[PDB]
Ligand binder design. Structure first.
Ligand SMILES: NC(=O)c1ccc(Oc2cccc(C(N)=O)c2)cc1
Lengths: 197, 197
């Protein structure tokens, strides 16, 4: 487990409230405010989930071996409803629970490049207290191609070798604004931003 | 990587045909003929998939910690069509693939206690030549409960803590004949039996 995590005292899961003025808080606030300067952050929690971390780090090492010295990992955003937060914190992103996106590039879990996209009420639905929830997520985007609405897995790189897959798909390979992943443990929910108008 | 695997010349995937009449072949054959003695076995292959094995073993160690005992694994059967075999050998079982058979106990991957159940033509579909395909699968069934139609994950053990889930579901808790799992890397395809009626 990473050495800068708080001691969890044999526990397997903890949310750690960050302090404004720490580089760790300030980098996430800045990444968010870059496209959502109209909203205000209530708090930023670091998600310490030992099992999700272990399974994700195994998938990352495998994709680092399989791919040719790629940057396989991106830090992306995911807006969701309050009712989903306890499940995501504990169990991560389940494609079987994902909504149809208004532009579908496949049946999987969607992640945004820009906080502004995730900040829409469609994704980060305001709870009964007007709190919106957005995860900051390590995603194994790996080698990607433009997706299509029919996909239940990423497409093959080569139609004559149908099992050798792209790692993820995007809306546009030149100017990616979203990624879709189709496997468990391809995404680590690292931070939860709680925010308001 | 387990002792009984054979050398892979630094490769990460191999299908290894078992030698008839040796101890490993005999063991797997006996599990099949216990309920399928009227069938003809053409061959048995050991599936040596390093990445699938690693991801599965990580989930096993996690479930052994969580359940506080090491009785979490069962050896079960899975019949499928010839066209799904390459995908299962490389990627394992995927709840998102199944646009085919019934899902009465939930939208997960189905496994049989008896080879005779998996030997049905609706699962192990005969190809042009009457060849049928069935996997022998290590499944992390863990603590299980009765399933029902529409489940996307196992139910919670107590709805007072709705994120602490059962590991799998079954048709019948007292005398199970099938198990359903809802997460990637909860099942390792260990052997592929090629056979005919
Ligand atoms: N009662 C049901 O509706 C039912 C659903 C799926 C079933 O599928 C299975 C069960 C066990 C194994 C296999 C298989 N693919 O080998 C398929 C069987 C019964």
């Amino acid at each position: 487990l990473p050495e800068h995590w708080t001691d969890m005292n044999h526990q397997l899961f903890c949310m750690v409230q960050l302090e404004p003025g720490q580089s760790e808080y300030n980098t996430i606030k800045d990444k968010f405010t870059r496209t959502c300067s109209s909203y205000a952050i209530e708090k930023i929690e670091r998600i310490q989930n030992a099992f999700l971390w272990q399974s994700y780090q195994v998938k990352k090492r495998q994709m680092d071996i399989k791919n040719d010295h790629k940057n396989n990992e991106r830090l992306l955003f995911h807006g969701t409803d309050a009712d989903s937060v306890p499940y995501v914190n504990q169990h991560g992103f389940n494609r079987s629970c994902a909504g149809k996106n208004a532009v579908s590039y496949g049946k999987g879990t969607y992640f945004a490049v820009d906080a502004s996209y995730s900040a829409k009420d469609t994704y980060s639905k305001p709870d009964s207290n007007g709190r919106k929830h957005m995860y900051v997520v390590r995603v194994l985007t790996g080698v990607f191609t433009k997706g299509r609405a029919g996909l239940v897995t990423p497409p093959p790189k080569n139609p004559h070798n149908p099992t050798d897959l792209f790692d993820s798909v995007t809306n546009n390979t030149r100017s990616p604004k979203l990624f879709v992943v189709f496997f468990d443990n391809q995404a680590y929910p690292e931070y939860l931003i709680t925010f308001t108008a």
